[model samples]
Target: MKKLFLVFWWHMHQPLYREPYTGEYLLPWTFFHAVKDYYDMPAYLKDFEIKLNFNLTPVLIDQIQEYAQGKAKDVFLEAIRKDPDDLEKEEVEKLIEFTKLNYEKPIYRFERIRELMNKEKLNREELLDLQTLNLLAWCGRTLRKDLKDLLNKGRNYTQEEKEYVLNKYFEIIKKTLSIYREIKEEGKGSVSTSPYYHPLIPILLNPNCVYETTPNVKIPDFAVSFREDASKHVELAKEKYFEIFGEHPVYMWPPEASVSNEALELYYEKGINMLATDEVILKNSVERASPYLRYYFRELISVFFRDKTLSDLIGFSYHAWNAEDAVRDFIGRLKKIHESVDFQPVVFVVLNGENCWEYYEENGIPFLEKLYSTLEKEEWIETLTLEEAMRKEDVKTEVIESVKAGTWFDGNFLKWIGNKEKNEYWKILIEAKKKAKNDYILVAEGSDWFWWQGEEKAPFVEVFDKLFRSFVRRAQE
Candidate 1:
């Protein structure tokens, strides 16, 4: 009997968080999610037959390597390492600001950490506990077996405990990279990559491409030839992937699933075979009997579309429901896809692996466990990594000469460009174009600056704003 194919692709990225001159991470997210999500997201799949794609952006990989090498430190890291008494008044206030936002996941799970937050006036010991738990909260659930007893021994943490946890953070970074290498070597899921800095490649290559997607799309007049910048980002990322994983990624998850015919050709020339985008792009480009199957372009590259409805539900919905209900709801959706199509189905369930977990109970661990187990137990449904799914002999895909320019949302670039804040930021970046060097231009081009502006609202907009402005300022010098 023909079966259903499922692809659980996760995009792992952090903005180039390092301040160009200082080499310090202005935001703690890279380090924070590294401990909590990055390692655990993949490492957790070790027990199951589950396989998927993880797009580890090169900038994130480089930053992780720096942290692993003991060369990287952020304000949060400084707070974690210092005695609470040693923290300046300003430093304590800074910690307080980040502490509340960081607690969205951990505070709900750890009562002692919650109780300490309630104390109006924290003493040095309580302050120290706060710092330790903040870092400890993000540590992967299963990856820290040695700290299991300490995590259970919870309340009244000492400096020794704090020191040990900080050290453990570094070890997890190293282990996280090692896990990917092992997974690839063992022939599990494939590891993919985005451009080094996660810029919107098509618009970077040629702003005119926007008109094809949204004929009246509003954008700044600040346009220049960024094809080399775009190519460099991909080439740098591919080289880094080879250096770290010991093999070049045959597939790539375009940054934000943003692609144009131009961008795909660049990727195609760079030795990539398979690529994927949000389903809207596929539907807009061709009349297809099934949205689930892959399509080939010029017979040289295969591109698939993510099942946006299913992915959004996993990302946004299902968190409030119980695990069994969530799993059933997800499986039922797959069943509907199976019934709707004539061809054997290949559904791509793609989204970020890290941030969404904060919204789920137990960081979505129970839900994932149930979902993976159900996919395995249910004989009709089969899970394959993007690479395997595309190449499976039983599954045949159609051919398309070109793709419409769009991203995962609404088949356009509104998310990254065209807003009062976003438009202003683009203009801010343009000033650096004439006066600054390529590094400044490329750094400013990162989607994270545009990502945080407008409705996307990444936490700490001020930090992103400062980084973008600072990069431009340095470029002018």
Candidate 2:
């Protein structure tokens, strides 16, 4: 019987933030996301019959362990743990800057936090509420019941309340990997992984691979190949995943779904039986290809290209609509695909599991809950992990000899390497790699260092730049 198999591959990542010398995290996003996205992403699925892959970056696993052990501390943690009365002006300013919330919605999720921010100048207790509720507001839905009584009190948070929120954040961190383990053990889902430090392996192996997608695009004047480093990154990723998950990951979703023939083969050599790429990359490599079909390489490994239109709807569009409406619209699109196809179609929807949720209401619980339940009830639709998708006996795959070098975006590296700031940073990375051969230099090769450099840059782009520069300095020394 033919059916629609939906593959939801969720990429969970955060850049390595520990400063080698200071031992302090340059940014708090790692901890911030830990409390909000990491814990609940897999934890919430425990009750559902859904199957998806949570691709954890190896570096993120180590950082989570650090925070869970009280070894790593970020600015937000420092402020929230301090006596609000003792907060310096700079500390208060930092609090104000970060409190805006990444989701861009009003602070209405917490009535007390909303009202406190409205004041022209915050009093000590009000500031305390801001610090506590800041973390409290982003708490996972599963942990909401645990924090319910305090949230009901609304304002004037006590010291115990503050400690409760802080403690739970760490508790969730300690349990984050366990959630993945729990789901994997129960057959509820699977967990995959990305290269350590999340470097763009294709570009690292061959700079000219970019021309495969953008023939005339300008790049850095100087180039250096780090194929050896790329291999090490892959090795470290598999090693770390095995150490944490009790077995190596069966699939590798190249950082940003970035890939080339050279890169895919490296992953295959590492024992990754399956790989995932963007639809445009596969289309540019073969004639008359659709994201709905899986592509095979050398008859050895299987690949699935993502359905971007459907993916973007969830990542960018759906948050603006009602949960019910969003779920209806989403299912409506899936139905159209099912109806248009003659046989069982494979639809792969992949995106970041974290940042986008900030734009969603109550961290997208209502919408996600609706979407998951609806799909389970749809007889024609079945959700399968990429591993299961590759093993299906009845499902057949098309063979492709090679893929154009590209990312999940429009079959190009422009997002990570094309613009002014991006190109200059690439040159810096080249210089850094030439000087020293160490993990520091390799981590600097990551695509993320340049991702924040383009227009609409992150508010902390300077921080990322500083970290990259420090790596270059370490290489020189």
Candidate 3:
């Protein structure tokens, strides 16, 4: 009997925020440790039998460079700002001094102290500072809403601090890219796709964000040229891949499940062969996702489908599950799928990125290793690298029609980029693209921004607000 084949894939990415920038996710060690301890440790140290594909959005590569070198200290200070990493006396004393430097006579803003601090529920000045820390800690820490309501409510940042945070953040990214060059030398992992900003393309380009509230009507420019962005994004990625890995990529994982014939065309333009999206396959009809086929979207380019149930177990479920139990369930899930497919070659894609792990209780790697190790023993599941899947395809399936013009989530682009602010950012990105003669744009235009909606984790609206404004700002440069 032919052995059943499984292609394991993960998407990795971050946006371009050249170092010396702050006020956002510039946390260094916490982010790196998530990968080193959770993701990489399992894949490398545990000797797992894992052959997986990764999507390294150009932006994320930029981030790691900053985080690794610790040149992102200012950004870490952003995470630690106001709410500095809770000092238990000793660390607290050193951290308090840092607050003096960060808040009082900030390197960037003089007396940002009075501007940043506020009243606490406890009515104590010291506790008020802690409350401030809680709210301003998102740079590398968890979102703290209760305290943020008090600290950032009707608040205004000294323009200098904003500039400092933004500047330090970008500095970290340049450093991150350099670090990727170093890591690339080690040949530890493979890179794939993500965007300049994680866009909810369909909605960001148009009016899809209100789709849930206003179902079935398309917005004028909602994610229009989403395909073109894909073209520009993939090319930059390919360029960077060549720079970092010394090889062109054979695959691309579209950001936020945004898939379209246009996006496919973009990949084709970049000579990309393999493609993937969220488990939901966008088709003109409900019939697009055939129950019997696994890699049916193969055109001149091969397509891989995500096994959302199993991968979700790892992504959302792994945090709570014990390592061994999760591995068993994961393999069992695949084994069942193999039964239906009769062990033919199949692709089961999973997202790849370490930053998201912070949301999990223990971070998301222990179980990742367990799953990888289990694969080592499964003879029926032969793991093929995606490049192998693309170049060596036995057959090609023609795409019958335009992709149903949608994204991976509920087949709708809502939550983040499609919303007012994100859509606005997309507009700025378009303008930026026109102005951009060179350099990559991560197109950070996805619902990932919405994940930080409401409060200022990334402030779904603020991301685009700043994002688009950034476009206008860069146009002059």
Candidate 4:
């Protein structure tokens, strides 16, 4: 009997949010997502019979551990720790500025929070309530247990309650890594990771690799090579994975599912047996390759081309639908693939693990519960981690001669380059690398910093801009 193999690769990542010189976390997203997304993502799997891959980046792991120890400092944490009266005017403004919540999930769910976010001026008491609610809104199902009293209080939260929320935030952060470790130990999933700083490996190795897909695109002209830095990323990620999980990672989801032949060779040499990228890469590499079957790149490394439509549905579309309907829709699509293919199909659905949930109701718990339960009941469907899927005796492997240099987003590096701002940043990055005495230049090479370089006025653009420039400056001195 033929069965459909499903591999869900959840790419969990956050670039080093801490400023290079000061060590202050410019963004609190790492801590915020840890409390809300990290623990609950794996903790939800204990009851299910499904297995998937959780890709934890080294930078995110390092920051999480720092946060767990209560050693990392961010402006948001500082604001929450101070008495509302003690909060300076700038601090109050910061709180108001940062209080922006997702309209779909967190903001929509809480009426009082929505009301508070709308007001231009807030009294100290109102500010305290808003601060408490902002943190509370980011809490996932696991952390909510300890905050029942605070949740019920809703508004006009007291100092003690706010303190409790802050404490639980750390408590959950401390337990996140262990939860992933425990889940892996329980045979629910496999833990994988990306490079240390989540830089696009191909671009790091040779910036001209972008010309492979975008033949006419303009790139930074500075003579620079991060080949050694790319290798360092792999080595550092391996060390961090072993340090955290007590075993070196066998699977890696390249940052952004970005890959090239050289990048694939690097992972193969570094002892990674399995890698995944978007199906568009497979499409571009082979004439009639199906993403349903795993491919052996150079026959030395195993590769999985993610089913982009299905992955994007969960990542982008499903948040708008009800849980049952979304699960039904997803399962229906899987069933279609299973029946359509003669060979047993191995479908890889990979996407961001943390950022999307805020757009989902109940932190996407209801949707995941429905999806997992349905998958478990389907006897014809087998959910395996990327590692487990690769090891399957019946797993089919196709060989590809060469892979196109591209990323998961539209099979091109335009998101990290081609724009005026992105090109200028690359020039600065290359110049910094040439003069740098330290490795901070490597941190500046992170993909997120480049991805946010376009013409946009979001808070993240400003935050990443500062962080990117800081790394470039620090690298030189």
Give the winner by lDDT: 2 or 3. Answer: 2
Candidate 1's C-alpha lDDT? 0.81
Q: How displaced is residue 330 in candidate 4, in Å?
A: 1.0
* lDDT, residue 463, model 2: 82
Q: Candidate 1: which pairs clash?
A: none
Candidates ranked by lDDT: 4, 2, 1, 3
Best candidate, TM-score: 4
Error of 3 at 316 (Å): 2.0
The residue-by-residue lDDT of candidate 4 on 158-248, one tens digit each, is 8888888888788888899999999888888999988989999998877778888999988877586789999999999899899989998
Q: Write the per-residue lDDT of candidate 2 for residues 152-178, one digit (tens) a residue.
A: 777788767898788878888888888
Worst 10 residues of 4 by lDDT: 99-108
Candidate 1 lDDT, 1-477, residue by residue in tens: 878888888889998778878877887888878988888888867878868668898888988888888888686679778999899888777777777776665324677777887888789888887877776667677745678876777678898888888777778887888888877777777889988888999988877787887787678886556678788888888899999988787888888889998898998998989888888888888874456767888788888888889999989887888989999998888998888777788888889988887778867888988988888788888888766887797775888888889888788888778767788877877756767665767778889888777643545777887888877777777
Q: Is candidate 1 or candidate 2 better by TM-score?
A: 2
Quote each prediction's TM-score: 0.94, 0.95, 0.65, 0.97
Look at candidate 1 and tell me the lDDT of residue 191: 89
Candidate 3: stretches off by over 4 Å: 17-46, 67-73, 78-189, 195-230, 282-298, 343-345, 355-366, 391-400, 417-468
Pairs of colliding residues, candidate 4: none
Question: Best candidate, lDDT-wise?
Answer: 4
